[PDB]
Amino acid sequence: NNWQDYQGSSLKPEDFDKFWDEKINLVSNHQFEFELIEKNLSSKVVNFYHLWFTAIDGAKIHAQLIVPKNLKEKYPAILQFHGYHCDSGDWVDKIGIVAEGNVVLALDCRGQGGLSQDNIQTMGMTMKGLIVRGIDEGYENLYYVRQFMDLITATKILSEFDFVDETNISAQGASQGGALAVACAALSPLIKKVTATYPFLSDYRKAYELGAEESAFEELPYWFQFKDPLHLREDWFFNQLEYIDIQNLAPRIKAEVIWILGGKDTVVPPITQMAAYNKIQSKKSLYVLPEYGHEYLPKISDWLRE
Amino acid sequence: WQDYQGSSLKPEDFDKFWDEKINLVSNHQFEFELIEKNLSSKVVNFYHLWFTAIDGAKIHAQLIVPKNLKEKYPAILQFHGYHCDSGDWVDKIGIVAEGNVVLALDCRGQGGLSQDNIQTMGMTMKGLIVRGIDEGYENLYYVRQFMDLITATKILSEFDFVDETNISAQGASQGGALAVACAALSPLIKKVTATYPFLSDYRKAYELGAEESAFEELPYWFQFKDPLHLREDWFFNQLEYIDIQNLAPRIKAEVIWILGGKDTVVPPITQMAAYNKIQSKKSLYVLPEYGHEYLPKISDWL
Numbered sequence: 001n002n003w004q005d006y007q008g009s010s011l012k013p014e015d016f017d018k019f020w021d022e023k024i025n026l027v028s029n030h031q032f033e034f035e036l037i038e039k040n041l042s043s044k045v046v047n048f049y050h051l052w053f054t055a056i057d058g059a060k061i062h063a064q065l066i067v068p069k070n071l072k073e074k075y076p077a078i079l080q081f082h083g084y085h086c087d088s089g090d091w092v093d094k095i096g097i098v099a100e101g102n103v104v105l106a107l108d109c110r111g112q113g114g115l116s117q118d119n120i121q122t123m124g125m126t127m128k129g130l131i132v133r134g135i136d137e138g139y140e141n142l143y144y145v146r147q148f149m150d151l152i153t154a155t156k157i158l159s160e161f162d163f164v165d166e167t168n169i170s171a172q173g174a175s176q177g178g179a180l181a182v183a184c185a186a187l188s189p190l191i192k193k194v195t196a197t198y199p200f201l202s203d204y205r206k207a208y209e210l211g212a213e214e215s216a217f218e219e220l221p222y223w224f225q226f227k228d229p230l231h232l233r234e235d236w237f238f239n240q241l242e243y244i245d246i247q248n249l250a251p252r253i254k255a256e257v258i259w260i261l262g263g264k265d266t267v268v269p270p271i272t273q274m275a276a277y278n279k280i281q282s283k284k285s286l287y288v289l290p291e292y293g294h295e296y297l298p299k300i301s302d303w304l305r306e
Numbered sequence: 307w308q309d310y311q312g313s314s315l316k317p318e319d320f321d322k323f324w325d326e327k328i329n330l331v332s333n334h335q336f337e338f339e340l341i342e343k344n345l346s347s348k349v350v351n352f353y354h355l356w357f358t359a360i361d362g363a364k365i366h367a368q369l370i371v372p373k374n375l376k377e378k379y380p381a382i383l384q385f386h387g388y389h390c391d392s393g394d395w396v397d398k399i400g401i402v403a404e405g406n407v408v409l410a411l412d413c414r415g416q417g418g419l420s421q422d423n424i425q426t427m428g429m430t431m432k433g434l435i436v437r438g439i440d441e442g443y444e445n446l447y448y449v450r451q452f453m454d455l456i457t458a459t460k461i462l463s464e465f466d467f468v469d470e471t472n473i474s475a476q477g478a479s480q481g482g483a484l485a486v487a488c489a490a491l492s493p494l495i496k497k498v499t500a501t502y503p504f505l506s507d508y509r510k511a512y513e514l515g516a517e518e519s520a521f522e523e524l525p526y527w528f529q530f531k532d533p534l535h536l537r538e539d540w541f542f543n544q545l546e547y548i549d550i551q552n553l554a555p556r557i558k559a560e561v562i563w564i565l566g567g568k569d570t571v572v573p574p575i576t577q578m579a580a581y582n583k584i585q586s587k588k589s590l591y592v593l594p595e596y597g598h599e600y601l602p603k604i605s606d607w608l
């Protein structure tokens with residue numbers, strides 16, 4: 001019941017919206033060069049393509065493109081994002097949803113398990129963690145600033161396909177993928193639907209307050225342990241992360257939201273995700289599996305088919 | 307433990323590769339700068355030492371000097387552990403008060419002030435052993451980190467108040483590995499005191515199951531970049547160039563090797579791959595009840 005009343009712990013800066021408005025404009029006015037190279041996997045109902053484009057910062061970004069065989073008609077499209085450390089997953093995992101008449105764009109995050117390039121440069125700590133990668137040069141140099149812009153760029157390219165129904169584009173993902181799906185719908189309001197599973201990257205100040213050494217937010221106490229153990233720049237540190245806290249993007253969402261989480265999740269605490277969910281103002285639904293944690297959630301996928 | 311020969315597959319080009327890097331540093335005039343540290347002491351002065359490496363990165367070190375300077379002093383290069391920095395300035399007051407010069411080097415991008423400028427198309431999430439491995443061993447993080455050791459030794463020896471004939475190196479874990487590597491790439495070093503050195507016997511460290519050790523990056527890379535082990539041979543062939551057991555034979559300094567018997571962070575078997583290949587005067591000290599932690603009593607004993 002209190003999850004409704006949790007307003008979050010963020011300190012949204014006045015300049016937040018101007019920053020992201022400018023980034024949206026930059027993507028819209030940029031003509032992106034991309035390339036499609038078919039991957040050799042034999043199927044009777046689907047074709048597979050490597051999608052390579054150059055981001056606004058020069059980095060080479062990779063995505064999985066999975067399309068039906070008949071391309072003479074337009075299909076609804078689904079943007080799918082993956083979890084921390086992982087990649088876009090097995091190609092065959094997309095055969096079912098595209099066989100129903102959909103186009104899937106599975107984006108690879110920069111410098112993780114996939115093929116996308118990380119080109120963040122910094123004078124500070126590069127040992128571990130991608131939330132704080134580049135934090136010394138300010139929020140403008142944060143890794144997720146470019147990672148969020150890849151979502152807008154992927155949506156732009158996906159929307160301009162002659163076989164993609166631009167009116168029915170949706171986003172889905174788990175953990176980090178849930179955060180990126182939420183950010184993708186907020187930064188590209190054309191998105192019609194979002195299905196986010198225990199989204200990450202939310203309420204950094206609260207995630208630190210809970211004690212994050214065993215959570216997915218462990219890089220935050222790690223940074224203080226080795227970069228600022230006396231907490232001399234605590235305010236400055238969390239002020240940079242405000243620009244990549246998805247709860248600050250949540251109000252801008254116009255898509256329908258389906259939110260799924262596990263009640264025993266200690267990797268991504270439910271309280272930090274509710275900071276973002278409570279600030280969604282469009283149509284939203286919240287589904288909980290009490291006995292499950294940061295893991296595969298059964299049955300819920302059949303429930304939503306209805 | 308004496309007869310363990312290591313698991314390395316030393317590449318044909320290994321010595322030719324590192325000989326060129328030593329020559330490159332030896333023939334290069336490095337630009338450095340000294341900036342006063344505000345720490346107040348009656349027996350020592352503290353200085354920020356900033357130099358630019360041959361690759362452009364800005365490298366930082368702590369320089370701690372006695373108050374007098376008209377005569378030469380023995381010098382000590384000191385290196386730190388994984389994730390850490392050069393430590394508190396006051397930790398060096400005692401050793402410098404005895405008439406020594408301490409250069410405490412900060413590793414690149416590891417919590418200290420030194421810059422990491424490795425660029426790669428591959429995984430940047432975690433780990434500095436495998437940082438830049440996709441572009442080959444030339445782009446490995448520790449190739450430039452090892453050259454910083456040679457460069458730091460170069461600058462330290464060229465001070466008019468440093469007795470270049472009595473330069474030694476010390477460190478623990480990563481610092482122990484860098485201390486060992488420092489002696490191999492600069493044989494002028496007279497003494498090495500290495501405490502449970504890291505960065506040795508990568509193939510064996512993986513074979514033991516490294517998920518709970520300091521080598522966890524190696525299974526991590528396979529877990530997310532190559533789960534079917536399609537490039538296992540290529541992976542460990544790149545790491546040969548930064549395995550200190552391959553550098554150990556060229557060491558001429560006397561070596562003091564200290565380790566803890568219960569160490570699961572850096573298993574002793576990987577350390578012995580490097581220690582057994584040292585051919586100069588060497589001694590081995592073991593604390594059976596201690597692990598990867600502070601080792602008492604041994605400092606007084608020496």
Ligand SMILES: [Ca+2]
Nearest residue numbers: 039050091115
């Ligand atoms: Ca592939």
Ligand SMILES: [Ca+2]
Nearest residue numbers: 343354395419
């Ligand atoms: Ca300082």
